[PDB]
Amino acid sequence: MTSKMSQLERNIETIINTFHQYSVKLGHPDTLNQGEFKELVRKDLQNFLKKENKNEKVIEHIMEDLDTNADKQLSFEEFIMLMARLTWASHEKMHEGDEGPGHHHKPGLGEGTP
Amino acid sequence: MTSKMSQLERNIETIINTFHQYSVKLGHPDTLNQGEFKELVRKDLQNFLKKENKNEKVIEHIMEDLDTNADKQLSFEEFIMLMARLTWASHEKMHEGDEGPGHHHKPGLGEGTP
């Protein structure tokens, strides 16, 4: 086994460093501030949170409501719970209608895929 | 743009459904219980949390200490903060010594990669 690393672990690492590229805009990337968080959602989550991406104030809500440390910033733990909120959304997408549809939801969350 | 999906979003989705395969062992996968969480860490996080993976009691701690809903289970939000704990660890790995080493840490977190 050359690849000790696993599917989830690599996936987490990829998330961590990319989220941190938005976080690193302040230097030692220890957070996502209002601007960094908005951009983060605007670029990568633009699809999963696309409905949310259409408004700035909704993102502003996650921006500071999740700001448990109350600095208008998001620490690893704070933005990570954002991923849980999004997990609940992807939980709803997890019920793929393709097995037997009662009502069809859009791909990946809201996505249009041929 | 055929791939509306983004690097982080796909990465999150991959995490969600795989974590949920361990969560789905109970049916509607709404959690990771003690056994499901241990296995989850044991299989995928076995590398990132490898030092932790060597003990069961440490995983048991994350198992129920993170169990904010106090059912000896981990909801999406509860296991997601686990990923933040692991984010702090990967934050330490994020300081890749390869740019200019003062002290070298093992790859990806603890990994040995040629």
Side-chain angles (χ1 to χ4, degrees):
Chain A
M1 177 181 294
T2 180
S3 49
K4 167 62 189 181
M5 283 152 61
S6 193
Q7 183 182 211
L8 281 173
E9 156 276 330
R10 294 180 291 127
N11 266 83
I12 303 167
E13 207 290 301
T14 305
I15 294 188
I16 295 173
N17 74 83
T18 314
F19 260 79
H20 284 184
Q21 85 167 90
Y22 300 95
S23 319
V24 74
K25 302 182 61 268
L26 184 65
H28 67 107
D30 197 78
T31 185
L32 294 157
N33 87 329
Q34 182 181 91
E36 301 164 318
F37 183 66
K38 290 174 66 186
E39 182 171 69
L40 175 277
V41 176
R42 185 167 290 160
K43 313 271 102 282
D44 276 88
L45 303 183
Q46 65 167 211
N47 35 37
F48 263 17
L49 301 183
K50 69 206 314 176
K51 74 298 276 43
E52 186 165 76
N53 176 270
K54 186 180 179 299
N55 294 149
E56 297 195 273
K57 299 172 62 180
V58 192
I59 307 171
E60 290 180 67
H61 185 84
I62 308 172
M63 207 294 100
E64 184 185 291
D65 179 77
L66 277 67
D67 167 53
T68 57
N69 295 326
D71 202 81
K72 282 76 266 179
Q73 289 186 150
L74 295 186
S75 186
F76 325 111
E77 299 173 278
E78 311 179 288
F79 69 66
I80 211 70
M81 64 181 63
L82 179 274
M83 252 59 65
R85 319 184 65 248
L86 164 64
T87 292
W88 183 88
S90 307
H91 170 267
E92 311 297 280
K93 186 281 301 182
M94 189 178 62
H95 286 253
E96 180 175 87
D98 185 78
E99 302 299 280
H103 59 98
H104 66 98
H105 64 252
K106 296 195 67 57
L109 217 164
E111 281 33 81
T113 51
Chain B
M1 178 181 294
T2 180
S3 49
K4 167 62 189 182
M5 283 152 61
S6 194
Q7 182 183 211
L8 281 173
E9 156 277 330
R10 294 179 291 127
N11 266 83
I12 303 167
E13 207 290 302
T14 305
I15 294 188
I16 295 173
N17 74 84
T18 314
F19 260 79
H20 284 183
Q21 85 167 90
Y22 300 95
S23 319
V24 74
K25 302 181 61 268
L26 184 65
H28 66 107
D30 197 75
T31 185
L32 294 157
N33 87 330
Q34 182 181 90
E36 301 164 317
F37 183 66
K38 290 174 66 186
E39 182 171 68
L40 175 277
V41 176
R42 185 167 290 160
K43 313 271 102 282
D44 276 87
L45 303 183
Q46 65 167 210
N47 35 37
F48 263 17
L49 301 183
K50 70 206 314 176
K51 74 297 276 44
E52 187 165 76
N53 176 269
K54 185 180 179 299
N55 295 148
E56 297 195 274
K57 299 172 62 181
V58 192
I59 306 171
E60 290 180 67
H61 185 84
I62 307 173
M63 207 294 100
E64 184 184 290
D65 179 79
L66 277 67
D67 168 53
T68 57
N69 295 326
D71 202 80
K72 282 77 266 179
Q73 289 186 151
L74 295 186
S75 188
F76 325 111
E77 298 173 278
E78 311 179 289
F79 69 66
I80 211 70
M81 65 181 63
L82 179 274
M83 252 59 65
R85 319 184 65 249
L86 164 64
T87 292
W88 183 88
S90 307
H91 170 267
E92 311 297 282
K93 186 281 301 182
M94 190 178 61
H95 286 253
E96 180 176 87
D98 185 78
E99 301 299 279
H103 59 98
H104 66 98
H105 64 252
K106 296 196 67 57
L109 217 164
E111 281 33 80
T113 51

